[model samples]
Target: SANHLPFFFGNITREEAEDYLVQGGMSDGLYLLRQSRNYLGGFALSVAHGRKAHHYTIERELNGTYAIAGGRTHASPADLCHYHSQESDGLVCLLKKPFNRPQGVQPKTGPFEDKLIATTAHEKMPWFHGKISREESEQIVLIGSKTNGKFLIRARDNNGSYALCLLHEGKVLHYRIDKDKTGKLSIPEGKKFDTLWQLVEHYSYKADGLLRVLTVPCQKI
Candidate 1:
């Protein structure tokens, strides 16, 4: 009596759900339903919008119907998601693409060199301090004028990963840089970028999900 719904990612934590949505481009309406951790016997709807994730609790009524508080009830979770896809109905955005698990199979064309080139090419940029510790990055950013948006990128201990450290409200905030399956880079719940420079270019003009717009780069000297 199990229903095979592609969007139902069973028992995943909120953070994992966000990761899946972010990997899926975080476009408006991209979403998935997951087993609720807090509300036993209930469900949670996770939706992506404007580079952020929003969650809504779907409680099961005593009569076996489900609904978000103050919303119309549906006989099943699928029915609820289907209805919201067509209308926002008080949700952040209409539910559209369902989060699909990435396949393990290899592509026929093989790995693309362009993806590798785009990532490694940022090494020559002054703002990218490859292979530096988190503390060192904090010190470097703090050494400067301590402007709200001064920032730098440093390599994490995990070989291929990187982190963006920035000064905000006189404090330094470090956001991990994650790469999607296609090798595009982005901070959690933020827009994807083909390269670190491009990411910098974006946050420079708009805060987006970042605490402040990147106004200056902690250039390597």
Candidate 2:
């Protein structure tokens, strides 16, 4: 109908297509118009698939580097008109924004990029994800009373890195995670984790043959 054609929104996923009916403040669900000249928005919906990948614009999102909705904020289609094959799957839609790590840092991508990408929801904080400036980063604290009186460390550094810092006795311990040139995830002198949260979960079971889940309240400074 005329109304449906007028408003079309496109969403991407790893697998399967789902509808957003009556959700996220939408009426009759969001839809997407054809990828022809009728894209309407300045930033058109574009995609890249197969083993081939696309670079992105240098325009950075306010949050430095982060992931949201399954895509990296800094990784977007080279252009809004980007396209892919209809038969293809695993096509990633990179955002228009671009981000840079601190000087001389070998940029980390893959799951690390996914970690930097902001997750909109988490049990500890109903609202999480997004970038913060160095000054603002100083203002934000990742490990606090939100996890009950128990302690754990969770944070992303400005240098395109993730750290699991905790207090084991009276001393503060910091574990650094890195992504090599190939975008593989690893911890220096520690266990490998696919995500920042997984690193946190690892410590939750640091004790001998036991499971420790930090479901209590956690506050991000």
Candidate 3:
């Protein structure tokens, strides 16, 4: 199902936007703009709050491990991309990365976690920009890439239905975590991914050697 889905597309444009309002093509108003060719034109992710923000899709480089952004085939030496995550304490994110220099030189500084984010990009999501992080990608999962970065936004609706989506193209992949009306999502040990909070950490924009974390809380349909 993930493969069949687009990467991620943000925000719902009004009926005025011609590209999104193709006659009889999409009943959801603005479905998604796939394969953006515009140099400056791109997509963003929508939230229960207001809507829209800077967003991009990650692609694998160097034999499927590193993440490439900033119009490059590999991750910027520093994370300089900007995005948003819909979570507590999360803010509207912006990763303004520096040059790439993962090689040469010594004098390793900062926490390893802070130097390079330990994302499943290498171990998982080989073609990840559109794929899941391997754990909750399967079965019932309510998740999406918050800020269009490595982090994903996963949660169970108030109705107890869980789903997952990619931050890149706003691709709604799967949903089937809990059927309980009590908002069933918890991470004890092996079933941790069942919980939205456990599936990941609060991805700081700077934590990944990129931009700083930005977030805002909101509702969803």
**TM-score against truth, every candidate:** 0.46, 0.30, 0.18
Off by over 4 Å in 1: 1-119
User: After best superposition, candidate 2 residue 38: deviation in angstroms?
Assistant: 43
Residue 173, candidate 3: C-alpha displacement in angstroms: 3.2
True-structure lDDT of candidate 2: 0.31
Q: How many angstroms is residue 28 displaced in model 3 relative to the true structure, after the best TM-score fit?
A: 58
Worst window of 10 by summed lDDT in candidate 1: 105-114
* Model 3 misplaced stretches (Cα beyond 4 Å): 1-158, 168-172, 179-190, 202-221
lDDT of 3 by residue, 147-187 (tens): 43323334343333343333323333332344334333422
> What residue pairs clash in candidate 1, if any at all?
none
Find the candidate with the highest TM-score and give its number: 1
Model 3 whole-model lDDT (C-alpha atoms): 0.28
For residues 144-219, could you state the per-residue lDDT of candidate 1 as single tens digits? Answer: 7667788888989877678999888889999999877966678898776556666776577568788888877787
RMSD of 3: 20.0
For candidate 2, write residues 84-186 as lDDT tens digits. Answer: 2222223353222222122443322222123234331233441223343333432333334333223333446544454433333333344455866744345
